[PDB]
Structure formats: structure tokens, C-alpha cells
Amino acid sequence: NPLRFFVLTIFPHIISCYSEYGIVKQAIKKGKVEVYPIDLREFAPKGQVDDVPYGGLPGMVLKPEPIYEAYDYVVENYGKPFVLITEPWGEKLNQKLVNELSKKERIMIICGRYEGVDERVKKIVDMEISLGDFILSGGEIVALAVIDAVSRVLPGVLSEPYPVYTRPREYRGMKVPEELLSGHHKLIELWKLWHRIENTVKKRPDLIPKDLTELEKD
Amino acid sequence: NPLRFFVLTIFPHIISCYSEYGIVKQAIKKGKVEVYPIDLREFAPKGQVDDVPYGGLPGMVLKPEPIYEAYDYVVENYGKPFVLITEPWGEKLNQKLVNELSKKERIMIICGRYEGVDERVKKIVDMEISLGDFILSGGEIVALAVIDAVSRVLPGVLSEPYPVYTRPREYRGMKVPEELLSGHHKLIELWKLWHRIENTVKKRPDLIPKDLTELEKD
């Protein structure tokens, strides 16, 4: 009962492709996760997987039938999945959800597109990724982010997981902080850098620009 | 002619695979954007992209040389890029940025990995995608989101930019709200469901689950 992911999308290759590298690929290779891209079009008549919405709107919406059909196919061939939906405007998860999800066994991620998914689908939706603050054209990227975040918090995948520096001791004249270089007589000093700088970057995510509008209304 | 992206990554194919579909492909098709995946490995001087960090930390950090070399190449062959970095733990952008970025000509996105990027890279970084509340194993997914978001608000790409329903009028016994259904005698009534339901799903991102441990914390 390795964690199985079932991603519903009109672009399955994007999912296959992301699973061939990094931690997702490591997770799969170690039998800790499986990722199944389900092509919505294989559950639809003339690939018409979207249609003109009602009440006159400028675009198209994903139909109920192919999504329900693909749901059934998954419940039948694998167990009943925990159904997650990523809409074109929804991308605001946190470590909480990731952890929660990491404890599951079967996950179906519906990748929203266009003007969204027909509400009748919500009847089999368990969770919806809340609005984020920017717009994508589809849910794939969020699905991958989910798959990514979850995969790396699974036991057996990740071995053992302030500014950081690496080998090149001096490059283009830029030199690593001598603190970080010696350090038995730095055990506590290296821990100085650690803090003396680990907080500066925490209250400084990005300057001043919008900081004058947010702070200025608190 | 044509907003150009340069994506520094050790997983080029992830980027090339996302560009073959959706809005990014359309933008590329129409000549509104170009996406150049830049393989970090092909720019590693002594063939080494990552190395052990100083101050003794559990892992590896991306080295400066290959990123600086890649940057240099971009500058010589295409023009100096506005440099953006997405770190393994950084995913909180907004429609604000997306728009600002769409007005640019050259963007290079340095995809983070491991324990991060040697700080010395920061000297040529213009903007940093702030922390986001969840952790990814790399910046690829954030890079793609950025490419996606920007591409869709470009002029010439998208043909002219509450619950939704589509053409199956009745399915599995589930029927579309009649009320959205006819309507001259609904030109205001369709605007009722529009609102009467447009607020429920806005103050109800989720449910009761985190509200008790966060709404009461403040």
C-alpha cells in the first residue's frame, strides 16, 4: 500500500515527465510513491472534455462525465481515492496539508482548467486547494507541487533532510565567511553566524515596495 | 518580438516538457515567448554542480561557478537578464509580480536545489521569490508557475481576457440550477445565484479544521 497518486489532466505527459527526475523519481524508485497520470481525453467522446458553460460566459468549462468516468475507473481499478482538486486560480497549500496527505494511501488530483470544473463534480471532491493570489492556466503545476511536497516528507525517500556556502573557498574574488571555515574553536561561533544572520533574512523576505502599503494599514 | 526566459536548472527536460502544452506552447507558437532551459551541468567548469557546504551542514548546496558561467553566457548571447531565483522553500508570488514581469524582455530564473544556492550568487540576483509555507525539493515548479502566469497575461496569447456548470443539463440525476437556465427573465436572477453563492465559497475556503487553531490564535 505504497502512496499512489492519480492525476486527472488533459496533459498526462507533463506529469510523467516531472516524475522522472529528482525526489519524485527517487520516491518511485524506492517504492514509496506511485504516480498515475490519467488522461481525461481517454474518458471522453470526441475529446470534447470541455464545453460552453451556461448563463453565458466567455470560455469553456470541464464537463462532469469524463471526470466522473475517470473517478469510477480509479475506484474500480485501485481503491477509493481521497479526491483533491486544483483549480486554475488555487495554489495556497502549507506543510500542514502536505503532512496530512503524506499519511494517506490513495490520492486523486483533478487538474482544473479553463473557467473551472462543473460543480456537480464537487460531490466527489474531498478537498479543494484554496485560492492563491495569482493565476495559472491549469492545475497541473499545483498537482506537481503537491506530489513533490508529499513525496519528500515520506519516510524512506529523504535520507536525512540563514545563508549557505560551498566548496569554492574564493570565487570571482568573493570569499566564504572565514567563520564557516575553521571551527572546533567555532562550534559556538559557527552558531553565531547561524543566528546573527538567520533572522535578518526572515524579517526581510523582499524589501520595502509593498511593505509600505501592508505595514501601513496594519 | 518576444519575451525570453532562461531557466537555470539541473533538470532541463522538466522545463522543455512543460513548454510543449497549454498556454506556454501557444505563446511560443505565436512568437510571444521563448523559453530556454539552460542545463547547469553543461556549464560546470570542473564538471561539478553541487558540493558540500561549510560550517558542517547535512547535504549539498549549488555551487557558484556554473550559475555565474550560465549567467555570463546569457549576457553575451542574448542580453543581460532580470535575474529571478526560486529557492526550494520559496513560492509566494502574486498577480502583481506576474504583470511587472510580463513587461520585461529577458528573465533568467535560477532554480534552487538541495540546501540552497551559494550566497555569492545573490550579487547578480535581482529578485527572490519569498518563502511560501510549504517546502519543495527544487525551484523548477516555481519557475514553471512563473512562466505560465506571465505567458497567459501577455497580449496576443489569450483571446481576450461562484459555482459553474456546463452542457450536460442533467447527469447522474444531478441537474443544473434551472435558474441559471433560461433568463431574460433571469438577466438579474442569474446575477442572484452569481452573488447569493459567490460569497459562501469565499468565506469557506475549507471548513472547521484549522480555524480553531488559527482564528483564535490572533
Side-chain angles (χ1 to χ4, degrees):
Chain A
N1 41 64
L3 170 37
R4 292 189 183 68
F5 268 113
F6 302 93
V7 195
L8 198 48
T9 167
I10 75 180
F11 299 124
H13 187 209
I14 276 166
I15 310 287
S16 290
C17 189
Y18 192 82
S19 312
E20 277 169 33
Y21 304 94
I23 319 307
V24 180
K25 168 206 175 211
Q26 187 181 302
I28 295 169
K29 179 192 184 280
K30 293 179 173 204
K32 307 303 169 198
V33 306
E34 289 168 12
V35 177
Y36 297 82
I38 312 283
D39 184 355
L40 250 190
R41 295 158 304 152
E42 319 272 46
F43 291 90
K46 229 325 216 295
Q48 217 200 67
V49 304
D50 54 307
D51 206 337
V52 187
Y54 278 111
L57 280 311
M60 51 211 95
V61 162
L62 297 185
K63 306 182 63 173
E65 314 99 293
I67 298 173
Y68 262 98
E69 225 62 48
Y71 175 79
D72 295 349
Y73 169 93
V74 169
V75 164
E76 295 192 40
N77 290 261
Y78 310 93
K80 177 180 203 258
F82 175 86
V83 176
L84 183 45
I85 190 164
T86 60
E87 301 273 23
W89 52 77
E91 49 289 342
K92 181 201 294 174
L93 41 172
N94 35 282
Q95 271 308 78
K96 179 207 67 166
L97 287 169
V98 173
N99 294 298
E100 295 182 28
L101 298 161
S102 60
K103 280 173 62 81
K104 287 178 172 35
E105 278 171 344
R106 270 155 282 114
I107 301 176
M108 181 162 263
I109 299 175
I110 300 173
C111 301
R113 267 252 148 186
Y114 312 120
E115 321 325 279
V117 172
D118 190 271
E119 269 294 305
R120 294 171 283 182
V121 174
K122 294 298 209 317
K123 295 308 82 40
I124 64 179
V125 167
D126 281 300
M127 183 198 279
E128 190 167 18
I129 303 296
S130 63
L131 290 73
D133 320 7
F134 70 102
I135 299 185
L136 292 169
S137 69
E140 287 71 24
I141 286 168
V142 179
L144 298 177
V146 169
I147 298 177
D148 186 279
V150 174
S151 288
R152 71 173 285 288
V153 297
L154 290 178
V157 175
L158 265 179
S159 257
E160 196 60 342
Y162 65 84
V164 306
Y165 289 81
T166 198
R167 212 82 317 196
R169 180 192 173 301
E170 172 168 0
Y171 180 81
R172 296 290 183 71
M174 289 168 287
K175 298 200 296 176
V176 175
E178 13 65 300
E179 299 172 298
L180 301 179
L181 300 174
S182 50
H184 285 270
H185 38 64
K186 287 194 179 49
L187 282 161
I188 301 178
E189 178 189 348
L190 297 177
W191 262 63
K192 302 278 82 267
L193 181 166
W194 264 51
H195 303 306
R196 235 207 58 151
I197 311 177
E198 181 178 50
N199 275 22
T200 63
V201 309
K202 296 211 161 298
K203 290 297 178 186
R204 214 167 334 301
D206 354 87
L207 20 164
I208 296 207
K210 71 260 146 144
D211 177 279
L212 248 315
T213 287
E214 60 186 70
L215 172 198
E216 277 55 26
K217 183 187 180 56
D218 287 13
Chain B
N1 307 276
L3 168 56
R4 294 199 173 70
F5 283 104
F6 301 96
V7 192
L8 274 53
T9 165
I10 64 174
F11 301 125
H13 297 205
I14 284 159
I15 314 297
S16 96
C17 179
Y18 188 90
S19 297
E20 274 169 20
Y21 311 90
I23 312 316
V24 167
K25 177 204 171 205
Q26 186 165 318
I28 282 162
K29 242 277 164 259
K30 295 171 169 197
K32 306 320 186 153
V33 309
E34 287 173 6
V35 172
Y36 299 87
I38 312 285
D39 202 336
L40 258 177
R41 298 159 306 153
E42 317 271 66
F43 286 89
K46 333 176 229 200
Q48 215 175 37
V49 308
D50 59 322
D51 204 337
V52 186
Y54 288 106
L57 277 309
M60 63 214 95
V61 61
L62 288 185
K63 301 180 62 225
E65 302 96 302
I67 292 172
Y68 263 102
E69 229 53 84
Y71 174 79
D72 288 354
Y73 164 95
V74 181
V75 168
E76 316 190 49
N77 290 286
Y78 299 93
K80 186 180 186 262
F82 177 83
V83 181
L84 178 58
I85 187 153
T86 59
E87 14 165 28
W89 52 83
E91 44 288 339
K92 181 199 300 186
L93 51 171
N94 30 290
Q95 260 313 82
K96 178 202 230 143
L97 289 172
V98 174
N99 294 276
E100 299 169 36
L101 291 173
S102 63
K103 287 172 58 85
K104 298 196 162 81
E105 284 174 328
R106 276 154 278 117
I107 301 175
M108 161 177 280
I109 301 170
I110 300 175
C111 297
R113 309 282 315 168
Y114 311 119
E115 317 328 89
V117 176
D118 174 277
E119 268 290 292
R120 294 162 291 176
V121 164
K122 290 304 201 315
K123 303 293 91 71
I124 65 179
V125 166
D126 287 297
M127 189 186 281
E128 191 162 22
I129 295 292
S130 59
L131 299 73
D133 287 58
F134 75 99
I135 295 169
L136 287 171
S137 50
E140 280 75 13
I141 282 165
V142 168
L144 293 175
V146 170
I147 291 177
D148 191 274
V150 168
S151 287
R152 67 170 298 282
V153 299
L154 284 176
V157 181
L158 281 176
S159 316
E160 209 340 321
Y162 65 83
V164 311
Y165 287 88
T166 191
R167 233 92 269 191
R169 179 194 174 295
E170 177 171 357
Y171 182 72
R172 301 290 189 75
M174 289 174 283
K175 299 191 290 181
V176 173
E178 337 100 304
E179 314 151 300
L180 295 168
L181 262 211
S182 45
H184 295 307
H185 41 69
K186 297 192 178 68
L187 296 183
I188 298 188
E189 185 168 339
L190 298 183
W191 266 63
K192 304 275 77 278
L193 188 154
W194 255 55
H195 299 309
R196 299 284 158 159
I197 307 182
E198 190 169 40
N199 267 26
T200 60
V201 309
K202 282 185 178 294
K203 288 294 179 188
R204 222 165 327 305
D206 295 296
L207 36 169
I208 291 173
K210 115 252 297 195
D211 307 88
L212 291 55
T213 317
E214 68 93 348
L215 296 177
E216 300 183 359
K217 305 308 91 182
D218 84 289

